[PDB]
Design a protein around this ligand. Structure first.
Ligand SMILES: [Cl-]
Ligand SMILES: [Cl-]
Length: 162
């Protein structure tokens, strides 16, 4: 298992514009187009992203290219964040994937707010971090997904995804 397969499981794959768990226009593999209530705004965002008049539908190959970019951006966002980098550097490969998943979903800033959890993880207090991670809007809004990431983070195994 790896980051790509992991996120593909958590986000799914859609080729037509859709609304996410929060009402935002998204497409492909969890690619947020816009926070705006506007479909046109979203179509415009899609064409700009894809580089063509899409008419709100992309191809699998298109979805995969956006996904590659987003993963890449997630990692580099981590490596450039001062609070995040040191944590990431301290973790094993599986747990690092758990961190990338979170940043993919909620952004560098959102994640930078799990301060307490982050510090515990740095100290390798798996259980306490896991509990702390659970006390969040994040877990309450998307529990099953949050549950999988937290287990991965706690255990450093892919069990939750097997
Ligand atoms: Cl983009
Ligand atoms: Cl969920």
């Amino acid at each position: 298992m790896n980051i790509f397969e992991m996120l593909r499981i958590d986000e799914g794959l859609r080729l037509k514009i859709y609304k996410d768990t929060e009402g935002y226009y998204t497409i492909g593999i969890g690619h947020l187009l816009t926070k705006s209530p506007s479909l046109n705004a979203a179509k415009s965002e899609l064409d700009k992203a894809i580089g063509r008049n899409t008419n709100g539908v992309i191809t699998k190959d298109e979805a995969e290219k956006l996904f590659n970019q987003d993963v890449d951006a997630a990692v580099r966002g981590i490596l450039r964040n001062a609070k995040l980098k040191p944590v990431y550097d301290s973790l094993d490969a599986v747990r690092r994937a758990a961190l990338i998943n979170m940043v993919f979903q909620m952004g560098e800033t959102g994640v930078a707010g799990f301060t307490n959890s982050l510090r515990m993880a740095q100290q390798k207090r798996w259980d306490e971090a896991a509990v702390n991670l659970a006390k969040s809007r994040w877990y309450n809004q998307t529990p099953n997904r949050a549950k999988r990431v937290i287990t991965t983070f706690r255990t450093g195994t892919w069990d939750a995804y097997k």
